[PDB]
Swiss-Prot record, chain A:
Highest taxon of the lineage: Archaea
Function, in words: Flagellin is the subunit protein which polymerizes to form the filaments of archaeal flagella.
Location within or outside the cell: Archaeal flagellum
Record gene name: flaB1
Keyword terms, alphabetized: Archaeal flagellum
Protein name listed in UniProt: Probable flagellin 1
Disulphide bonds in the chain: none
């Protein structure tokens, strides 16, 4: 009478042990994943990226050719990745729409000097136009605090006088940046013109 | 619990002959990685129009090889679907039919002669796993004779 | 007991992240537009 009761007891204890093993294993895994996901959420909360200063445009033959948009990282550090495969730049033109014009990030070695013409001329991209130039950086493809970034567009024969354009940056993490400016009436025959 | 999927940016529409023709909805995956499957047989797209209702307009996902360029006209013209209109275009992807973190998706609608001025439309995406995405926008009063117009 | 609480926590954190993303994006846009409009007013 006792022996079969002992056998049933052994079986039921063994079942409980397996249930406990599964429960602890999966509980530890889900706690770790919850930690990771809330950490990622806190990361996504910061790293805003914002426009620092005035947008400056290059005008040749009476029409705007290139656009430079100065940006910096928001308070909170936690830099934004500016890699080619992780960041997309959207350009919305009066007659054109481009979904991805980003070609990459090239280090701002100051070139020969910090001329807009020198920056627009020395740097070239195999495909697309928009690239970002980091200043005072450590040579990485991530924009961090202490680093100044100038995003440049090379536009072949858009942008006469008075029409609006829209530029959007889509980082993998953080808020998308929206920039909208209007070309002023007064454009010089050469050199940079401020867009305010 | 994860794999939310969310709208990243502004919805951009194509207008021809004074009426809105195509709609592009930029989406990305939420924090937490764990990509969302965008296969034809597992994802359904619902379009709710002022006079029309469509339960499934999804035709599939075609890789964003950047085509000749990233023009809205080029995307809407080169890609064609045998049945239905709505397709998703992945950017910076690895060639799979799953939208993962690091990949940017632009969902495009090809609407034959809906969408005049001022009427609303509703677009819903139904993944097999994760929350359904709801998008509702209103066409602005000012529409250009050609080119893309921003819907905010 | 803990697991469902963790799932609810994950969901609520993810919701907050989306709200933060929207808030920062629109706040930056509206600040830029305010800058532009006051610049135009000074011009006028």
């Amino acid at each position: 009478v006792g022996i079969e009761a002992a056998i049933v007891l052994i079986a039921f204890v063994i079942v409980a042990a397996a249930l406990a093993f599964v429960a602890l294993n999966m509980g530890l895994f889900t706690t770790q994943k919850s930690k990771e996901v809330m950490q990622r959420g806190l990361e996504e909360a910061t790293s805003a990226l914002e426009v620092d200063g005035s947008v400056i445009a290059n005008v040749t033959s009476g029409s705007v050719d290139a656009i430079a948009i100065p940006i910096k990282v928001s308070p909170g550090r936690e830099g934004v990745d500016m890699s080619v495969d992780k960041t997309t730049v959207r350009v919305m033109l009066p007659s054109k729409f481009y979904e991805n014009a980003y070609c990459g990030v090239f280090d701002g070695s100051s070139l020969s000097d910090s001329k807009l013409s020198t920056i627009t001329s020395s740097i070239a991209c195999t495909t697309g136009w928009a690239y970002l130039v980091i200043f005072n950086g450590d040579g990485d493809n991530v924009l961090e605090l202490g680093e100044k970034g100038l995003l440049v567009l090379e536009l072949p024969t858009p942008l006469n006088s008075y029409e609006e354009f829209k530029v959007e940056v889509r980082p993998v993490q953080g808020a998308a940046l929206t920039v909208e400016r209007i070309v002023p009436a007064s454009l010089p025959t050469g050199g940079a013109v401020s867009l305010g």
